RNA sequence: UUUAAGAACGUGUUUAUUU
RNA sequence: AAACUCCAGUUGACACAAAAUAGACUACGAAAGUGGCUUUAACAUAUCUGAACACACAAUAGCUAAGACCCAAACUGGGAUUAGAUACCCCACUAUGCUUAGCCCUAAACCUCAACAGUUAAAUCAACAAAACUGCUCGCCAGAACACUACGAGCCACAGCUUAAAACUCAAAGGACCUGGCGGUGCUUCAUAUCCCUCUAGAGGAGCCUGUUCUGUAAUCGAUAAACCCCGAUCAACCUCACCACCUCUUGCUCAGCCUAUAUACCGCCAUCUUCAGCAAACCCUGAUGAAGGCUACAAAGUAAGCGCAAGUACCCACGUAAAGACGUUAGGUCAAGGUGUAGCCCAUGAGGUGGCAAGAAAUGGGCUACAUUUUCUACCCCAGAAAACUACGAUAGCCCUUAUGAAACUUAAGGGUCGAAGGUGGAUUUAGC
């Protein structure tokens, strides 16, 4: 049987998100892409460096906002800019969010040598697409 | 297939459409009206509406083709028809006044008759009964015996007994023999008829 | 209750039992009205009426059911096949088909008088018929043709020896 | 579950959002139809997902949320319908009405139309139905038609019939054109495998054909290929009456002939009668051949062949 | 099936309900799931034919006694009245008898409904003054 | 399966 | 009513404001 | 096949053997048992039960003596089958089956349901079977096996029957059911490149390439019925590399490390049935409230979220091909992708350097090229000319030389020269394709 990126059915008590409920054969039919850049286009270059930056960002943000991320990130590149769009929870205090936004935006700008901006969208609870 | 079940096979007959409406029967008339609504497949390249089209010679050519080389198989077919034609003209000029009336020079008439003299009436089927096989005579359908005549003619020519002899000259020689009820292909048909007669008592082993 | 997980079987059986409730009649709200003796399939249950303070001296399952019903004092002996499901289905069967003192009076139109050794010969009327009281008495029977139980007759004659009967046990 | 009050609040957000969307695009909020909403949502939120049911959508709540049955009992608790306890009060109230109209008839005495399908009947009744239930109801309707039904009955039966758009299998004739000299001709296109051909058929000619500027017998040495070019004209008895000038590109030897055969036939339909065009269609001269090369699969030697299988 | 139309009409005329079709399992014992948790079951069931089409008792006779609903039934000589609360021994086959039963139950119900409106009007009118 | 033979 | 058709080692696979 | 061939067929004469149809009847007798015809004799008891201290009977088989003999037939012989066949199949023949006079006294002698009387209501009633009970009486049984045994006794019985234990041993045995699996299990309908028959091209033979197994070597590991075998590898001259030998370092590229053991501790990614269509929460009902089960449309207890199929989507459509394909099955594959539980090494099971093995007696899988004339060479890319059996067809092999890549090539690749081998279409068997 196939296993990649599939959430196995259960009794019915397990909540899943939209992206987590669709398998790889829906990535261009019912889902989009979590990262958007030009590396993988025909005739373009530096697709390998853009991938290592993505892998590091998803981990930097998972450990920098522990227990706060409601769903996967959405990385966007428009020229020199790098826009990180995240959906976070409302448990943490806003004072601590503004601290981490300025700490991460700055640390990542000096690391990758690019202007970085972070966009948060708070939700009360993790959105549920269905129950498996 | 890339066609749906709705698609119907085409009718290349050219004299069928020309039939006047007065001749159309109630059933035939209904059929023509129906075809207008149905979808039709695209005619293949093999068959056209020409007057020289021979479906039996087109099938025999396809049974000789090897690896999709239809240009070569058709070349061998026409060479054989030409060789059979020239051999009869050489036998027609050197014949007596009254012997020229019984010499067929049309290669097609010879090709159809030669194959008809090789068609077997009955065949054999291995029926498993009591951990043994038996050659039970069976009535062959009209298609089966038409296919066997072609396959035996092509197999005999492809035999290795003939050394550095080209296919058009080999096939042409067999067609004349068969046309005269001679040669090995005919003997193969007779042997099948002799093995079915010896195993006639085994006819009851057949249930269909 | 049946299920694959044990926690799910407890719910089904628990929530489904309140929809199949019986009503058990009790004599003075502490015991049964009369001695019962039935057989459900292969399981024999011989319950006996006892006075106040006797306690529950019966199969541990019956002790647990009786507390739910409200029977404080009763004796029972189980024989044959000790199957918890036939034992339970038969217990509820005999406890629901027991005739009270009021039904008996109405049935025969006579007074039901209670005789107690502690109260001497005083006749205590526990139930009387609502309808017309009969004027003729029941025909006294010289010898009753009632089937007896060798186990009870053998005990009354000081013949049932057992090193397991009448043992000191905890309160029930 | 979605209540009536919830739907009423969704109707108010769509109406207000419909006026915002018109203010963005610079249109008139009054004359802003639903076709303009779909065009503006595809520009502002461009999604190329292959599934159109997974793209951003801003429609009317009456087309998004599924239709739901109204409450069937009041405060006191008595249902509103006498066939409520059946569970199918709508399906059986219909069967009760139809069977009541069949009793009255006894006392006082299709091409485009298709019977309603099962899935379309559930929406009308807002009830879930089985297959055998659908067949029983359809049998009463047919029985209703056979009898001398009155005018009022016909209107009822037409609520459960749906029109059908009957396609026409009639070839489309090309417009005859005229050149500078004044000669009439017709142009068409053919396609066989990867070969693509454009053919120009003149109304009057001496049976001359030129492929890519070369006479046909030189361009197609093989006889079989020339037979294909002859099939369209021979079938309609027009050999030596037209002049053809075509240009084929791509494909192989035999695919270019079949592609030209199809184009010549399509362009030859303008200089023949309708009855002949129908005969050409029933002979397979106007149909594009869909048989194309099939792809090879991983784990296989070919499109359909498999690797040699070893049992042990 | 011969009297299905007649009975469905009577229930509509007397503002009552009818179930003359195939009885799905759980209409009474599992009603809250089929209809809804706030559904109200019947307070009285009237059997004009206590048998099904295979000459066996209707499943509702047993399901009604489970839900503590009193039943009225027309029992013929081949029926079982043990669980029917108010049985009426009479023919349940001929059409001349079924029209009578329906006419009697339709009238007794229509009267009571109108009898309460008179008792209430009097009480309401008397109460004010 | 049956044990192997020497 | 209708040929023959053998064999497969031993254990282990369910609870608690500036100022 | 053997046997018979003084055999076969028609007709006629002709039994001490066995008793169609009737019998779809259900009678007689204590049981055993009794079904062709006639005649004679003849089928106990005016309450019931009742002899394992006795009497009289008792299928078939078998014993003793004297007879009969069509057919059948243990034994035996021959033929055949089989790895063997002391059997199943065929042929032949004997004891025996029959009569008479005696013996033997057994059976699944079972309708496994005692005799007489009586009942159909109540709790009808574990299950199955042939519904559940009362009164009275006799007989019999008390875990399995040892045991239709030993000893003793009796009997026309002498390898016999009847009666009938014990020691040692076990924690079960046993009866009736549920579900599933399996059946050289029945009926019916089917398979669509699939089961048979039927089509086309191949494999199995030769050479070469390549993998594997054995053997060999100081010298990896893993896969290894279907579901391994140009498989992890879309790839090994050093490197890669985890192997061998030798040498060297010790808080070590890492707030160390280990390709050390365990895939029968796992995540992860997959194979397989699947070229399937079912899995199932939550309720209800049936079975006396058992394991379990749940359908009939002129409808009889089933309602069902959700997952999968389907539907949609991708490629050139509505077709087709892809993709998809649940729960589970094989403790299936992988600790050597990486991560990781448990256990183990820490001057070594870790790290680094140099060099080196990766072969072939042999067998086998897959594939390539050929054995030629529908061919070979050249031109052309389809109207040609030559070739055509010991200078033909035929090696991508060997040998030699050159070039390319690279620091490094008898080794890898390309080309040239030389060489001209097996091979003459391939055994049992076997693959794929609408
Ligand atoms: K028996
Ligand atoms: K071969
Ligand atoms: K080979
Ligand atoms: K091979
Ligand atoms: Mg797969
Ligand atoms: Mg191929
Ligand atoms: Mg009746
Ligand atoms: Mg053995
Ligand atoms: Mg075994
Ligand atoms: Mg007696
Ligand atoms: Mg006796
Ligand atoms: Mg005897
Ligand atoms: Mg004898
Ligand atoms: Mg004999
Ligand atoms: Mg023998
Ligand atoms: Mg004899
Ligand atoms: Mg005998
Ligand atoms: Mg007997
Ligand atoms: Mg007995
Ligand atoms: Mg007796
Ligand atoms: Mg014993
Ligand atoms: Mg014995
Ligand atoms: Mg003995
Ligand atoms: Mg003795
Ligand atoms: Mg290896
Ligand atoms: Mg291994
Ligand atoms: Mg392994
Ligand atoms: Mg190396
Ligand atoms: Mg090295
Ligand atoms: Mg190591
Ligand atoms: Mg495993
Ligand atoms: Mg696939
Ligand atoms: Mg699908
Ligand atoms: Mg394993
Ligand atoms: Mg392979
Ligand atoms: Mg060479
Ligand atoms: Mg160099
Ligand atoms: Mg040569």
DSSP characters for A29-62? Answer: TT---SEE-STTSTT---HHHHHHHHHHHHHHHH
For helices E4-13 and D89-108, the axis angle rounded to 10 degrees is 110
Select from B88, B114, B85, B87 the least CA-distant residue to B174.
Answer: B114
Q: Read off the tokens for A39.
A: 């590396």
Euclidean distance between CA atoms E81 and E61, whole angstroms: 9
Task: Using the Cα atoms of residue D143, residue D146, residue D147 and residue D152 in order, give the sign of their dihedral.
Answer: positive
Residue E55 has, within 13 A of its CA and on its CB side, a CA count of: 4
CB-nearest partner of D169 from B37, B44, B48 = B37
What's the distance, Cα to Cα, between the start and end of chain F in Å? Answer: 15
DSSP C155: H
> If you compute the radius of gyration of chain C from its CA atoms, what whole number of angstroms results?
20
Q: What does the CA dihedral C95, C97, C100, C103 come to, rounded to 10 degrees?
A: 170
With CA of D295 and C1' of each nucleotide, the nearest comes out as: H321
Specify the length of chain A in residues. Answer: 132
Euclidean distance between CA atoms E43 and C80, whole angstroms: 45
Residues of D in contact with E40 (CB under 8 A): 73, 77-78
Q: Read off the tokens for E20.
A: 């003359």
B touches C, CB cut-off 8 Å, minimum 3 pairs = no
Residues 6 or more apart whose Cβ sits within 8 Å of residue C14: C1
What b/e readout covers D155-189, taking b as 16+ CB neighbours within 10 angstroms?
A: ebbeebeeeeeeeeeebeebeeeeeeeeeebbbbb
Residues 6 or more apart whose Cβ sits within 8 Å of residue B139: B122, B123
- A20 CA from H332 C1′ (Å): 29
Contact D169 B11 (CB under 8 A): no
Q: Is C128:C114 a contact under the CB 8 Å cutoff?
A: no
Euclidean distance between CA atoms C2 and C85, whole angstroms: 14
SS3 C76: strand
What b/e readout covers E63-101, taking b as 16+ CB neighbours within 10 angstroms?
A: bbeeeebebbbbbeeebebeebeebbeeebeeeeebeeb
Within a 10 A sphere around the Cβ of B114, how many other Cβ atoms? 23
Contact D47 A28 (CB under 8 A): no
Q: Read off the tokens for B196.
A: 């079915």
Q: How far is C-alpha A113 from the chain's CA centre?
A: 21
Euclidean distance between CA atoms D35 and E4, whole angstroms: 51
Q: What angle do CA B155, B161, B165 make, to 5 degrees?
A: 85
Specify the length of chain E in residues. Answer: 129
Q: Read off the tokens for B113.
A: 């008759």
Task: With residue B72 as reference, give the H or E element that holds it.
Answer: helix B70-93
C touches D, CB cut-off 8 Å, minimum 3 pairs = no
CB-nearest partner of D169 from B3, B39, B74 = B39
Phi first, then psi, for residue A81 (nearest 5°) are -75, 155
Q: How far is C-alpha C44 from the chain's CA centre?
A: 13
Task: Using the Cα atoms of residue A107, residue A110, residue A113 and residue A114 in order, give the sign of their dihedral.
Answer: positive
DSSP string, B140-174: PPHHHHHHHHHHHHHHHHTSSSS-S--HHHHHHHH
DSSP C143: S
| Exposed / middle / buried, residue A20 (Cβ in 10 Å: 0-12, 13-18, 19+) | middle
Residues 6 or more apart whose Cβ sits within 8 Å of residue C29: C70
How many pairs of residues across B and D have Cβ atoms under 8 Å apart? 63
Method: cryo-EM
Q: Is B123:B192 a contact under the CB 8 Å cutoff?
A: yes
| Exposed / middle / buried, residue D99 (Cβ in 10 Å: 0-12, 13-18, 19+) | middle
Within a 10 A sphere around the Cβ of E102, how many other Cβ atoms? 20
Q: Read off the tokens for B97.
A: 């006044």
Select from D203, D205, D204 the least CA-distant residue to D270.
Answer: D203
Select from C89, C99, C77 the least CA-distant residue to C162.
Answer: C77
Phi first, then psi, for residue D59 (nearest 5°) are -115, 180
Select from C70, C43, C75 the least CA-distant residue to C59.
Answer: C75
Euclidean distance between CA atoms D192 and D233, whole angstroms: 19
Task: Please state whether strand G lies within 7 Å of residue B131 at its CB atom.
Answer: yes
Specify the length of chain D in residues. Answer: 312
Distances (CA, A) of D264 to B49, B132, D208, D247, F4: 16, 62, 13, 11, 78
- D296 CA from G10 C1′ (Å): 52
Euclidean distance between CA atoms B195 and B123, whole angstroms: 9
Euclidean distance between CA atoms B191 and D11, whole angstroms: 90
Euclidean distance between CA atoms A5 and A25, whole angstroms: 10
What would the 3-class secondary structure string for chain D be?
A: CCCHHHHHHHHHHHHHHHHHHHHHHCCCCCCCCHHHHHHHHHHHCCCCCCCHHHCCCCCCHHHHCCCCCCCCECCCCCECCCCHHHCCHHHHHHHHHHHHHHHHHHHHCCCCEEECCHHHHHHHHCCCCCHHHHHHHHHHHHHHHHCCCCHHHHHHHHHHEEECCCCCCCCCCCCCEECCCCCEEEEEEEEECCEEEEEEEECCCCCCEEECCEEHHHHCCCHHHHHHHHHHHHHCCCCCCCEEEEEEECCCHHHHHHHHHHHHHHHHHHHCCHHHHHHHHHCCCCCCCCCCCCCCCCCCCCCCCCCCCCCC
Distances (CA, A) of D76 to E34, E37, E38, E44, E111: 20, 15, 11, 16, 21
Task: With residue A103 as reference, give the H or E element that holds it.
Answer: helix A94-112
Q: What angle do CA D48, D53, D56 make, to 5 degrees?
A: 60
Contact A30 D49 (CB under 8 A): yes
Euclidean distance between CA atoms D33 and D41, whole angstroms: 13
Euclidean distance between CA atoms E94 and E2, whole angstroms: 10
Q: Is C86:C133 a contact under the CB 8 Å cutoff?
A: no
Specify whether the backbone of A120 is left (phi greater than 0), alpha (psi in -120 to 50) or beta: beta
| Exposed / middle / buried, residue B169 (Cβ in 10 Å: 0-12, 13-18, 19+) | middle
Q: What angle do CA A94, A95, A101 make, to 5 degrees?
A: 80
Euclidean distance between CA atoms E16 and E3, whole angstroms: 17
CB-nearest partner of D222 from B3, B42, B71 = B71
Q: D77 in contact with E at a CB cutoff of 8 Å?
A: yes
Helices (H), chain E: 4-13, 31-34, 59-66, 95-128
Euclidean distance between CA atoms D123 and D119, whole angstroms: 7
Select from B26, B98, B72 the least CA-distant residue to B168.
Answer: B72
Q: Read off the tokens for D228.
A: 């294909």
Q: Read off the tokens for B135.
A: 């050659």
Task: With residue C39 as reference, give the H or E element that holds it.
Answer: strand C36-40
Residues 6 or more apart whose Cβ sits within 8 Å of residue B127: B133, B134, B136, B202, B205, B206
Specify the length of chain F in residues. Answer: 6
Euclidean distance between CA atoms B106 and B155, whole angstroms: 24
Stated resolution in angstroms: 2.6
- B194 CA to middle of ligand 28, Å? 72
What is the chain B residue with the closest CA to D170? B36
Residues of D in contact with B40 (CB under 8 A): 281-284, 287
Task: List, in sequence order, every residue forming a beta bridge with B122; answer none if it has no partner.
Answer: B139
In chain F, helix, strand, coil percent, each to 5?
0, 0, 100
Q: Which of residues 48-77 of D touch A (CB under 8 A)?
A: 48-51, 54
DSSP A69: B
Euclidean distance between CA atoms B2 and D47, whole angstroms: 32
SS3 C82: coil
SS3 C168: coil
Select from D142, D136, D100 the least CA-distant residue to D118.
Answer: D136
Task: With residue C105 as reference, give the H or E element that holds it.
Answer: helix C101-108
Select from D127, D145, D146 the least CA-distant residue to D72.
Answer: D127
Strands D209-211 and D243-249: parallel
Distances (CA, A) of B44 to B12, B142, D192, D264, D286: 10, 25, 11, 16, 12
DSSP string, E68-98: T--EEEEE-TTS--TT-SEEEES--SSHHHH
Task: Using the Cα atoms of residue B170, residue B173, residue B178 and residue B182 in order, give the sign of their dihedral.
Answer: negative
Q: Is C123:C115 a contact under the CB 8 Å cutoff?
A: yes
Distances (CA, A) of C129 to A108, A115, C97, E104: 98, 101, 20, 40
């Amino acid at each position: 049987k196939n296993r990649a990126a599939r959430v196995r059915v259960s009794k019915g008590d397990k909540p899943v998100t939209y992206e987590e409920a669709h398998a790889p054969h829906y990535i261009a039919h019912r889902k989009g892409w979590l990262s958007l850049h030009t590396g993988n286009l025909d005739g373009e270059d530096h697709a390998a460096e853009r991938t290592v930056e993505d892998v590091f960002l998803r981990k930097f943000m998972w450990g920098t906002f522990p227990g706060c991320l409601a769903d996967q990130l959405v990385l966007k590149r428009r020229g020199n800019q790098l826009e990180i769009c995240a959906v976070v929870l409302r448990q943490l205090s806003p004072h601590k969010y503004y601290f981490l936004v300025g700490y991460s935006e700055t640390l990542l700008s000096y690391f990758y040598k690019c202007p970085v901006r972070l966009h948060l969208q708070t939700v009360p609870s993790k959105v549920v697409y269905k129950y498996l | 297939s890339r066609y749906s079940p709705e698609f119907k096979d085409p009718l290349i007959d050219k004299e069928y459409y020309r039939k006047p409406v007065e001749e159309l029967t109630e059933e035939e008339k209904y059929v023509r009206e129906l075809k207008k609504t149905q979808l039709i497949k695209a005619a293949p390249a093999g068959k056209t509406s020409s007057v020289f089209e021979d479906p039996v010679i087109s099938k025999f050519t396809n049974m000789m083709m090897i690896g999709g080389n239809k240009v070569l198989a058709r070349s061998l077919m026409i060479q054989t028809l030409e060789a059979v034609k020239r051999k009869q003209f050489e036998k027609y000029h050197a014949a007596s006044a009254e012997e020229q009336a019984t010499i067929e020079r049309n290669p097609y008439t010879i090709f159809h008759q030669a194959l008809k003299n090789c068609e077997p009436m009955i065949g054999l089927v291995p029926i498993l009964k009591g951990g043994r096989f038996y050659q039970v005579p069976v009535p062959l359908p009209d298609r089966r015996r038409r296919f066997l005549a072609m396959k035996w003619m092509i197999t005999e020519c492809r035999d290795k007994k003939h050394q550095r002899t080209l296919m058009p000259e080999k096939l042409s020689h067999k067609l004349l023999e068969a046309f005269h009820n001679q040669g090995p292909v005919i003997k193969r048909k007779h042997d099948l008829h002799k093995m079915a007669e010896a195993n006639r008592a085994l006819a009851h082993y057949r249930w269909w | 209750g049946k299920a694959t997980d044990r926690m799910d079987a407890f719910r089904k059986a628990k929530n489904r039992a309140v929809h199949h409730l019986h009503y058990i009649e009790r004599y003075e709200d502490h015991t049964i009205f009369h001695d019962i003796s039935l057989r459900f399939k292969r399981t024999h249950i011989k319950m006996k009426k006892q006075p106040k303070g006797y306690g529950l001296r019966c199969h541990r399952a019956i002790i647990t059911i009786c507390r739910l019903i409200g029977i404080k004092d009763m004796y029972a002996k189980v024989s044959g096949s000790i199957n918890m499901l036939s034992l339970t289905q038969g217990l509820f069967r005999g406890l629901s088909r027991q005739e009270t003192h009021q039904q008996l009076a109405d049935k025969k139109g006579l007074h039901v008088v209670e005789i107690r050794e502690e109260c001497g010969p005083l006749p205590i009327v526990v139930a009387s018929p609502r309808g017309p009281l009969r004027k003729d008495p029941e025909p006294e029977d010289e010898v009753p043709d009632v089937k007896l139980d060798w186990e009870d007759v053998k005990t009354a004659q000081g013949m049932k020896r057992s090193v397991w009967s009448n043992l000191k046990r905890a309160a029930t | 579950t979605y209540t009536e009050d919830f739907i009423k609040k969704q109707i108010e957000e769509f109406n207000i959002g419909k006026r915002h969307l018109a203010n963005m695009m610079g249109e008139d909020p009054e004359t802003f139809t639903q076709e303009d909403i779909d065009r503006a949502i595809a520009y502002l939120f461009p999604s190329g997902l292959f599934e159109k049911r997974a793209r951003p959508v801003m429609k009317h709540p009456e087309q998004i949320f599924p239709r739901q049955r109204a409450i069937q009992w009041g405060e006191d608790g008595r249902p509103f319908h006498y066939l409520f306890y059946t569970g199918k009060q709508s399906y059986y109230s219909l069967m009760h009405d139809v069977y009541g109209m069949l009793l009255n008839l006894e006392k006082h005495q299709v091409i485009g139309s298709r019977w309603l399908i099962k899935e379309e009947l559930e929406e009308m009744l807002v009830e879930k139905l089985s297959d055998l239930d659908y067949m029983q109801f359809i049998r009463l309707l047919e029985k209703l038609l056979t009898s001398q039904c009155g005018a009022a009955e016909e209107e009822f039966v037409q609520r459960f019939r749906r029109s059908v758009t009957l396609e026409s299998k009639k070839q489309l004739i090309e417009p005859v054109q005229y050149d500078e000299q004044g000669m009439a001709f017709s142009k068409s296109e053919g396609k066989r495998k990867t070969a693509k051909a454009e053919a120009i058929v003149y109304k009057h000619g001496s049976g001359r054909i030129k492929v890519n500027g070369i006479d046909y017998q030189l361009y197609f040495p093989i006889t079989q290929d020339r037979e294909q070019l002859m099939f369209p004209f021979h079938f309609v008895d027009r050999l030596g009456k037209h002049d053809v000038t075509c240009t084929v590109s791509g494909g192989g030897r035999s695919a270019q002939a079949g592609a030209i055969r199809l184009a010549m036939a399509k362009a030859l339909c303008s200089f023949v009668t309708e009855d002949e065009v129908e005969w050409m269609r029933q002979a397979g001269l106007l149909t594009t051949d869909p048989r194309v090369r099939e792809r090879k699969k991983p784990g296989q030697e070919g499109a359909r062949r498999k690797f040699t299988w070893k049992k042990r | 099936r011969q009297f299905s139309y007649l009975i469905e009409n009577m229930a509509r005329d007397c503002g009552e309900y009818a179930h003359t079709r195939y009885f799905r399992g759980g209409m009474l014992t599992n009603a809250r799931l089929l209809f809804g948790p706030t559904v109200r079951l019947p307070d009285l069931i009237i059997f004009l034919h206590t048998l099904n089409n295979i000459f066996e008792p209707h499943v509702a006779v047993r399901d009604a006694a489970k839900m503590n609903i009193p039943t009225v039934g027309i029992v013929d000589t081949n029926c079982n009245p043990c669980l029917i609360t108010y049985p009426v021994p009479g023919n349940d086959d001929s059409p001349l008898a079924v029209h009578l039963y329906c006419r009697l139950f339709q009238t007794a119900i229509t009267r009571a409904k109108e009898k309460r409106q008179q008792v209430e009007a009097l009480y309401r009118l008397q109460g004010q003054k | 399966s049956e044990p192997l033979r020497k």
